[PDB]
Symmetry: C3
Subunit: 599 residues, 3 copies
Amino acid sequence: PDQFRAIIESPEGAGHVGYQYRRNTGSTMRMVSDVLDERVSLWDFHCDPSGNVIQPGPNVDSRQYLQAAIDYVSSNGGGTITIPAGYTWYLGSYGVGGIAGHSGIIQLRSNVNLNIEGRIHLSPFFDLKPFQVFVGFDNGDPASSGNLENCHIYGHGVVDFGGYEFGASSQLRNGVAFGRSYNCSVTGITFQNGDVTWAITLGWNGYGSNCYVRKCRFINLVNSSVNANHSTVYVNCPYSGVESCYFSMSSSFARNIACSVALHQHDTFYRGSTVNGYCRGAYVVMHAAEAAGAGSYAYNMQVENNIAVIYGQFVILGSDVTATVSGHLNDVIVSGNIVSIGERAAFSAPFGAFIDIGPDNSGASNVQDIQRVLVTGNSFYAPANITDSAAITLRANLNGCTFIANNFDCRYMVYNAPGTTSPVVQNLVWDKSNVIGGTHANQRAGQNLFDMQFASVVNSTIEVQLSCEDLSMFSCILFPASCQLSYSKITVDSAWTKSMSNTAVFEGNQQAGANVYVSYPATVNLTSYNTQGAVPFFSTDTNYAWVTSAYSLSINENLDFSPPATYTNKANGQLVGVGYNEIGGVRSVSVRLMLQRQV
Amino acid sequence: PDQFRAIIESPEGAGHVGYQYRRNTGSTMRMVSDVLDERVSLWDFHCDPSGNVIQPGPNVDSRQYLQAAIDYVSSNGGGTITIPAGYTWYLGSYGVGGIAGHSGIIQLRSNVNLNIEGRIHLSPFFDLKPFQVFVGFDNGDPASSGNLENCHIYGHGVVDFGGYEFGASSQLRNGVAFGRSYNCSVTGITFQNGDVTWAITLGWNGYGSNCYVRKCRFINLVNSSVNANHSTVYVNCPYSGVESCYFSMSSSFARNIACSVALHQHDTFYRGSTVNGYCRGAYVVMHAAEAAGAGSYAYNMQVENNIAVIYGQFVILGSDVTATVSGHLNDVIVSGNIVSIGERAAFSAPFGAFIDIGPDNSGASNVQDIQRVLVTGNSFYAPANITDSAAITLRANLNGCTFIANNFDCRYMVYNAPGTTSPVVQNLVWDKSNVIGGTHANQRAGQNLFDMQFASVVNSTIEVQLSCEDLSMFSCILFPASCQLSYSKITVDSAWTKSMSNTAVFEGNQQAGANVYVSYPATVNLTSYNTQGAVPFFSTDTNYAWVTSAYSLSINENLDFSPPATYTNKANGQLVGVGYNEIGGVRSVSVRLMLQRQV
Amino acid sequence: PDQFRAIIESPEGAGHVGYQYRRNTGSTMRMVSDVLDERVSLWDFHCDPSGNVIQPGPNVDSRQYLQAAIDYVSSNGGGTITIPAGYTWYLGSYGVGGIAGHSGIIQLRSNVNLNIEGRIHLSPFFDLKPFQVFVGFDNGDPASSGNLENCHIYGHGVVDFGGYEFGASSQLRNGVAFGRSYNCSVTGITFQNGDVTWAITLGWNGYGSNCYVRKCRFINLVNSSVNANHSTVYVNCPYSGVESCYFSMSSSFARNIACSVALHQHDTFYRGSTVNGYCRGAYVVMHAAEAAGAGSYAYNMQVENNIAVIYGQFVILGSDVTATVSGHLNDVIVSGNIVSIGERAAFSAPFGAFIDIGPDNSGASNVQDIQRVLVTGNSFYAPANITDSAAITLRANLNGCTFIANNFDCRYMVYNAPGTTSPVVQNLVWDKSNVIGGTHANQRAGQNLFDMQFASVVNSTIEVQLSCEDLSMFSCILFPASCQLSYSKITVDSAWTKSMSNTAVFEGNQQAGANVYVSYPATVNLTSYNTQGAVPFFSTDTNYAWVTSAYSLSINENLDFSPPATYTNKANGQLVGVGYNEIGGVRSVSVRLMLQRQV
Ligand SMILES: CC(=O)N[C@@H]1[C@@H](O[C@H]2O[C@H](CO)[C@H](O[C@H]3O[C@H](CO[C@@H]4O[C@@H](C)[C@H](O)[C@@H](O)[C@H]4O)[C@@H](O)[C@H](O)[C@H]3O)[C@H](O[C@@H]3O[C@H](CO)[C@@H](O)[C@H](O)[C@H]3NC(C)=O)[C@H]2O)[C@H](O)[C@@H](CO)O[C@@H]1O
Ligand SMILES: CC(=O)N[C@@H]1[C@@H](O[C@H]2O[C@H](CO)[C@H](O[C@H]3O[C@H](CO[C@@H]4O[C@@H](C)[C@H](O)[C@@H](O)[C@H]4O)[C@@H](O)[C@H](O)[C@H]3O)[C@H](O[C@@H]3O[C@H](CO)[C@@H](O)[C@H](O)[C@H]3NC(C)=O)[C@H]2O)[C@H](O)[C@@H](CO)O[C@@H]1O
Ligand SMILES: CC(=O)N[C@@H]1[C@@H](O[C@H]2O[C@H](CO)[C@H](O[C@H]3O[C@H](CO[C@@H]4O[C@@H](C)[C@H](O)[C@@H](O)[C@H]4O)[C@@H](O)[C@H](O)[C@H]3O)[C@H](O[C@@H]3O[C@H](CO)[C@@H](O)[C@H](O)[C@H]3NC(C)=O)[C@H]2O)[C@H](O)[C@@H](CO)O[C@@H]1O
Ligand code: NA
Ligand code: NA
Ligand code: NA
Ligand code: NA
Ligand code: NA
Ligand code: NA
Ligand code: NA
Ligand code: NA
Ligand code: NA
């Protein structure tokens, strides 16, 4: 009797109230508390020392309560803790132990999922300070850290970084660091209102597997001139990636420092996402410094079906070395992306590009080992005023990259700044199916469409096809004398080129090379002998010693004679062909020819 | 004592039964009611005025109860209401207030999600009437409406529209109208058994952001001749889209009126979906009338990796104007789609096409501003009998569209009906890597494969490559005299063309234009002079004044002489070349030549 | 009083404790048990005959309890049963009734979902025995089976097959067989640690619709030499597919027997997945034996945007016949995939290929009807030592396949073993935009890059373009005399071919065919007449009767004369052209020419 009322009102009371599911006589005879025990929320730990629930709010630090919840569920082999809807849960202090070395707030634990339906907000304790909100490392030294496995963060909720600026450029800030992370994911969450280094990082220097970010939103996560660098997701473990996410920034500083994604280990991907307001789209890089967990090669790298408005470069490739490890990047695919450089002044942000072959972080351009890249079926656009826009900026050594069936509408097709680096280039393949747009027609005074500012080019193919005129350009393709060129194929289709003074330019006469295969239009003056009948025409200039055949691209306005349709050369570098004089006389004509060498 | 039993049996009783999670002494001391209060379902509001639960069913109108649930959860800052499995919840009356102007049933509210696990069915009250089942507007005038934010509808449940036909063509019917919608989504739901205008609409005239439809099914949603028009999803806000959905119709009327998706604002996408039984795949359109919320430009438009069997056109492009706004469409990508026209009689449904450049809703063809479109890596097929099948129907002004590396197997490649509209065409690029299939070989009597029925063509490229013979076709490409052609490149590869009478046809001799670059095969009769030795051959006809070079595509069956391998022209329009007479005599030959102009 | 305490402690007690949601006076007056009844878990059925809960574990067989749960929820129109986190639930006996014919453990039922958050593990009762863990058939004969509808398995949980090997090769093992399955799915689950035939199968011989596998992981599911054959997912119903899954194997035996996916009915897809350690990627096949439910045609088949490291073939196409049904495969797309053959010895696994046109299961190569396939925008790589690597192994009759804008870097481009099958080939299209990599340069002694070991080839296109030299290869393309060739286009671009002895080889002189269109480089010796002036040069050999024109690909080192730029032929099979002797004399030269026929 008295026993009973007291029991019922006690914390043990629910364990004395019987329950059987749907009154089914074959079901377990349970107590109410057993069924309530099948789920868990923050409210089950958000209490004072006497067990009284505490309401969250700006003046309550929820950190210790959420940790206690995580720790406890961990102790039972895992489960999912709900962070309730209709409330904002503030975090107001650093965590302790292994995550202190990472400016950690909350420590994640294996098999313990968080279903965030409400909002998590940082309190002003964190203003001008570093922080990493959720950390999966269990040791201040990641090398001595245990793993995080089977940890999923998901829901319709929000992580809000409080708007606080960085205090010093050297500080780091993160949303979720999974650590040495295996089968972990973030799904559905909005990260917003911050000045951070990363929102999410996956893995640690190759350690980890099967980590993903899906259907998340990242909004306004750079806000200050102090922020040194930002990559919204960093993928540092294999068999991991980003899909169907939304990234947006409005800060000016984001246009110069912020990237959406870094893919830094093999078998990783970035797909189906939309980006606006960022400097960069994705890094695809093998850092030798990060090669411990999964080898020294980044391969099976996929960037596909994204939409981007960026201010700098869409995809940036790299590889580098340490004293004892060499990083390699190969087997990459970039496909189906629709990208534009946003409205901006020329040179007002980092040099606009669809692909950038960038130097290492110390600026070295002679360490890279990048090859077997396929860039196909993408579109790129930059507004006509943006002088600093290229399909590819090729600024460090390149061991191969293949372009097929893209549509590039920008200032340059291939570019590298003269004076600067002199890359060694092998296996650069630009197929004829790359369509060159006309937005920048008439803007190219002084400029070469393909500006080949390299140390050397080998085993390469550039097949130039225009789709409209641009008589402002100096040349379609130019090689400076300092660039060696061998075992290559270089062609300029004649369409829309009849009025161009220069089409292809070889400043060191490199097209004469034994295994250079070239064709391009040129104007040539010829003079014939006076013989009636079949009669030779010869070029007045003697700079065609390399030419294997030429043919006419001009009509013949004459009745009494015709120049040759086709020409060979002579040892003195003249062209020669056999035309026809109906009546005799020395002829003199100026004709547009297709010059060919070994093609 | 008496107090206590009564309390326990009262509605407050659960608030007197103590609970502490898993008997953990560090957990909150709560009451059973607190834990039950962490979730909510329709059953918590589906009661009579005395609080007694009401069972749902065909004779119960669940609308007021579901609204009360929504309203209440809204009052606490949101949450997710479950619509329970194992029941069908019928709706049987219109809602009241702001949604009445939209024939609204239920009003959605911000942060209030619906987890539909059971079924929602419309009662016959709605037969022959308009309706919009869930509405996110809060005002009858959308312009005066507040926003809907953070509203997600998801689950394994079903919205069933009762099979009822439309009462009048002018009526509108919708499943979910999110309104001025920000971070809202539908995931997992089946919409079925109706005659509706749309299943889901996202945004309002550019207002909204981050709205998505994912893994939903839309089955049999047009059923009558009354239905004026149908678009299963309409995307009217930016940074939004449709992915991994399934659309199917079985009605004949669907084959003539129904589209799966309309993408009508920037940064929107349609991906990874399967469509069957529809007239159309997707509209990609900027209506000037819809430009208020997000500007007058639709850009970053993506249709990718879909599978479709349709009866009309797969992708339809458009832009139009109002008295004060002009709509523009640019930066579109259409890629990876596999599409076919379903089995049907020729002309039995709207003209079959992979891409359609359509006029505005009033039929105007001189208002459009469509450019920077990339169509790449798609397949298209129509059965051999379907005369009305084209890769592109180009029926209104076009400012650019690029085709690369597609496989088109239908009746026409480029088409527009003669007599009808006369589009102004710029920057139409058909790369040589488009593979033209052979299904319609032998069906093309009287027909031009590329039928260029335009006012004019400029800055365009058509590179024709056959992969099999079709000697039934009148020509590979024809330009009527009314079509101007300038600054263009038009080529017909010779393969499978040796027996064609006409390859390329320029009915106004437009290929003579100063900046027209063309090549195609032709048969030419020549006659030589009688001279032994090097000897000229000249064409008998004088219609080659435009030709810059030609070369032989025929073997020489003669021993005693050979015609020229290559030819130029003469001012009188003859071709001329130098052959060789081993023995003298006037020769007369008929030879297949590749005619070239400026290429 | 005494009544009351006893009631409260009874299993009916929760039904006597009142509850009203959030104390809202407008909410339903319910009892605690009603709210608890909104959810259900295994714990509600995992009890002994007296209703006492039983803890799971290795010595407890949970099968009967889970079945009872399923059966009961089925009886109420469905719902979702949770399999709780933090526990491993072992299965230790076969089920009974309709699923016994399928070695069934658990029987799935319509509208009854499983949310697996914990782990399901097979007990050693199943060692060396067949089993199918979840079965949706309700009859031992699938033909007499009812349907399974609206059944979803999802969660962060795990199905673990216990590591047990197969007992005999003839046994079958499966994870989830949905049966005649309509709107069923598996999402999020890890399947691991087994030796099984399939992890998941969808549909039955065409019966079923809208079945999907998404975000699942399949890890180490083949482990023994006994395992006859493995396909991780088998898709045997239309409008179904696999997306965003992860497949990995470590067994040697997997490298020879295991495929990730079989797509075997129309409108099916495989996308966005990562594969490692498998022999094969996907089968795309129409078995006549499986044509009952959805017709005899597999069409709208999509393999897109996958990443794979395999040891055999990536995509395998097929179709076959029975006494009364003929299977057809058409309208396929393979796009955006990045694939490599993993490190292995030559010939150590089945012949490496990106695409394989395979014979039927009995080895027949003359039954297939495969056409309208598009292979575009993929990358493929095999290490240089793997002799048995091809872009396409074409081993059975082919009615069409189109390749555009791929990047293939392996030993062969087109291959079939000589001696073996002699396929009939139609409509094989290899566009010039396929980039041929250089990894295998110098490895090709004795080998033809395109080895055309067929009965016949018709309506085909091979446009060979090299991007680097490989002087080790015997030829770029070879046709044996036994292969007929007609109505085809075969071209070898000259770049990187100047030093090749053979470019294209027609061992039966098939290039002479009336409708064969060919061009390739050759070296030709010529001798002139002694005449000063315009002078003929003629070839010394007489094997050019088929040549329509040739032109020089060599420079002219002479001052006193030049050979012809262009050549025709003569009836005796000599080439002839008109050059120029500045001074007279018989000349003799050896020149590299582009030989052309009808192009
Ligand atoms: C913002 C960004 O990612 N930018 C990349 C650039 O990345 C390099 O520079 C960034 C600058 O923020 C990182 O370097 C900073 O952080 C590392 C790591 O922090 C330490 O280790 C982590 C595990 C721990 O939690 C922290 O408390 C720190 O102790 C510092 O070592 C370094 O001094 C500092 O400048 C980035 O480092 C990588 O970060 C990822 C994600 O957290 C880790 O998984 C890696 O271990 C770590 N790498 C290294 C080498 O330490 C630098 O790699 C790229 O180099 C460039 C090419 O893609 O693109 C962007 O600019
Ligand atoms: C079915 C379809 O979408 N077809 C498109 C076509 O769309 C135009 O025609 C359809 C015909 O159904 C729509 O026009 C009808 O509906 C509008 C909107 O209804 C009113 O406003 C909404 C907000 C409110 O809830 C309703 O109660 C109404 O008050 C009517 O104004 C119009 O008279 C009527 O014919 C479609 O209108 C658009 O609908 C979307 C989705 O609901 C709204 O977000 C837009 O505001 C509204 N646009 C306009 C201009 O009002 C018409 O745009 C396309 O034009 C064509 C090209 O893609 O393809 C299909 O045929
Ligand atoms: C592993 C794999 O799928 N390999 C494919 C290959 O498939 C053929 O061979 C496999 C070998 O395992 C299957 O054949 C075996 O299984 C069938 C089906 O089992 C019976 O029916 C099912 C419904 C029931 O549950 C079981 O108890 C059995 O009664 C046996 O009939 C056959 O004797 C046995 O060798 C595969 O059969 C298909 O399996 C799918 C998935 O379960 C079913 O939906 C189909 O009905 C069944 N097909 C047939 C014809 O019975 C065989 O098709 C492919 O042929 C090949 C080309 O893609 O690739 C792989 O090698
Ligand atoms: Na640190
Ligand atoms: Na490549
Ligand atoms: Na140099
Ligand atoms: Na209205
Ligand atoms: Na374009
Ligand atoms: Na005109
Ligand atoms: Na069986
Ligand atoms: Na094809
Ligand atoms: Na033969």
